[PDB]
A paper describes a structure:
To investigate the basis for substrate specificity of this family of enzymes, we crystallized Mar2 and compared it to the structure of LarA8. Although Mar2 was produced in L. lactis cells coexpressing the NPN-biosynthetic enzymes, the resulting structure lacked the NPN cofactor and substrate. A possible interpretation is that Mar2 is in an accessible state that is ready to receive the NPN cofactor. We observed that the residues interacting with the NPN cofactor in LarA (R75, K184 and H200) have corresponding residues in Mar2 (R74, K181, and H197) and GntE2 (R41, K164, H180), suggesting that the binding mode for the cofactor is the same in these structures. The first region, hereafter named “loop”, is composed of the two residues just after a catalytic histidine (His174 in LarA); these residues are bulky and hydrophobic in LarA (F175 and F176), bulky and positively charged in Mar2 (Y172 and K173), and small polar and negatively charged for GntE2 (E155 and S156), consistent with the substrates they recognize. The second region is located in α-helix 11 (α11), in particular the residue before the catalytic K298 in LarA; this residue is V297 in LarA, a Q293 in Mar2, and G286 in GntE2. The last region potentially involved in substrate binding occurs in the first loop of α-helix 14 (α14), more specifically W358 in LarA, K351 in Mar2, and N348 in GntE2 that point in the direction of the substrate side chain.
In this study, we investigated the substrate scope of several homologs of lactate racemase and discovered four new α-hydroxyacid racemases and one new α-hydroxyacid epimerase, thus uncovering a superfamily of NPN-dependent enzymes with various specificities and greatly expanding the number of known nickel enzymes, raising the number from 913 to 14. All of these reactions require the NPN cofactor, either added to the assay mix or previously bound to the protein, and lead to the inversion of a stereocenter at the C2 position of an α-hydroxyacid, suggesting the enzymes catalyze proton-coupled hydride transfer mechanisms as demonstrated for lactate racemization. The NPN cofactor, discovered in Lactobacillus plantarum LarA (hereafter referred to as just LarA), is synthesized from nicotinic acid adenine dinucleotide using the biosynthetic enzymes LarB, LarE, and LarC which catalyze carboxylation/hydrolysis, sulfur insertion, and nickel insertion reactions, respectively. Similarly, the catalytic residues (D72, H108, H174, and K298 in LarA) are also conserved in the Mar2 and GntE2 active sites, strongly confirming our hypothesis that these enzymes use the same catalytic mechanism as LarA.
Author numbering: 2 to 330, 352 to 415
């Protein structure tokens, strides 16, 4: 036994020493970003998953709409959109038959400069770039979960809809991308409101599609809006494009989700009694609110009655105002995970750490030594990069 594992903590690192036969250490396999992203887009458009290529699908269309967004940054639009329009032009579709719609959801409209940023100045000059108008939607049906689907008129009017965006793990929708570009981004306040209520279901969790009510509602509303085709950028932890998937809004998305899974999903035979999770260093552990991203990932791998040891400096404090005010009087995950014990190894003192219901230890080793005593031959799981590593049972 007695393996030494170093865990990132703030701007440095700290060691923990574990019986090697008691523990297992899971690491992400962060792929490097492609050397030529636009060429990668072109590759995947010749290689569409679950659909014939754009060449065969858009013949004779006159109102192609491309969905882009920067609700989530960094947007891939300026890389994905030009190679798409190249394919449309190749198939005989002129720039007057092409339209780009930005999915605002609840957010404010874009300035001209911000639109040029999102699509590139050359696309902006050739092709109309239109902000979602949340007050100009058209009802197209209700999902089986009761979400009325009211789509922006520009999108409703289209004879062909190409959804673009990122594809990564999402803490509620399981994964981003696919039909998510349409629902709720270019839908009405009603669609956005009711769909968002599914966030609080028990199956709204990262890495889960089937049985995820939020993901299922999204893909359903997306299907009532008849999204035709997706182009999605698979990102790594540095938000670099490692892969592009194109084609059927369902099948292409599943392919993208397997690439994410190859990088970040670490399947686990059962839940551990002790989980040691580092956020991976400053500034991912800059404050407790941000450290939650590590804890939200570790929460699925600890047993009922288990112990999480969260290694996160939080030099800048509790973080976001509404989250912090809740902890001392958005925080949802911490509240859920309190069927286990949580040690916080941080720059906080014991009094503050305990005031927010964490257990306190000076170092991770001290926390693990006291936790190990509370269990009979505990299984120990160590997540050195918990902000991107998803243990999955």
């Amino acid at each position: 036994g007695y393996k030494e594992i170093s865990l990132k903590y703030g701007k440095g690192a700290v060691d923990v020493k574990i019986d090697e036969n008691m523990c297992t250490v899971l690491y992400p396999e962060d792929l490097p970003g492609v050397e030529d992203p636009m060429a990668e887009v072109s590759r995947s458009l010749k290689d569409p998953i679950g659909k014939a290529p754009l060449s065969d699908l858009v013949k004779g269309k006159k109102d192609v709409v491309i969905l882009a967004s920067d609700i989530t940054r960094p947007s891939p639009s300026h890389i994905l959109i030009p190679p798409i329009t190249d394919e449309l032009n190749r198939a005989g579709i002129s720039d007057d038959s092409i339209k780009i719609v930005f999915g605002l959801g609840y957010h404010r409209k874009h300035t001209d400069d911000e639109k040029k940023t999102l699509v590139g100045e050359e696309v902006f000059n050739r092709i109309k770039c239109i902000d979602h108008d949340i007050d100009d939607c058209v009802y197209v049906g209700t999902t089986k979960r009761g979400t009325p689907v009211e789509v922006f008129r520009e999108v409703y009017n289209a004879d062909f809809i190409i959804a673009t965006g990122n594809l990564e793990l999402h803490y509620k929708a399981g994964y981003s991308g696919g039909h998510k570009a349409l629902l709720p981004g270019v839908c009405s306040k009603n669609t956005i409101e009711k769909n968002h209520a599914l966030m609080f279901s028990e199956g709204a969790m990262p890495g889960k599609i089937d049985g995820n009510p939020m993901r299922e509602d999204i893909e359903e509303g997306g299907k009532l809006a008849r999204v035709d085709f997706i182009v999605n950028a698979v990102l790594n932890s540095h938000k670099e494009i490692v892969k592009v998937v194109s084609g059927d809004p369902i099948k292409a998305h599943r392919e993208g989700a397997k690439y994410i899974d190859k990088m970040y999903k670490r399947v686990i035979p059962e839940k551990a009694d002790i989980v040691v999770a580092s956020c991976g260093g400053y500034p991912k552990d800059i404050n407790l609110y941000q450290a939650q991203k590590g804890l939200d990932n570790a929460q699925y791998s600890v047993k009922d009655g288990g112990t999480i040891i969260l290694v996160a400096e939080c030099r800048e404090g509790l973080g976001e105002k509404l989250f912090s005010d809740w902890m001392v009087n958005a925080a949802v995950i911490c509240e859920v995970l309190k069927r286990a014990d949580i040690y916080l190894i941080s720059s906080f003192d014991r009094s503050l750490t305990e005031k927010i219901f964490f257990k306190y230890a000076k170092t991770p080793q001290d926390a693990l030594d006291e936790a190990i005593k509370k269990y009979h031959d505990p299984k120990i799981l160590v997540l050195p990069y918990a902000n991107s590593t998803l243990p999955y049972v």
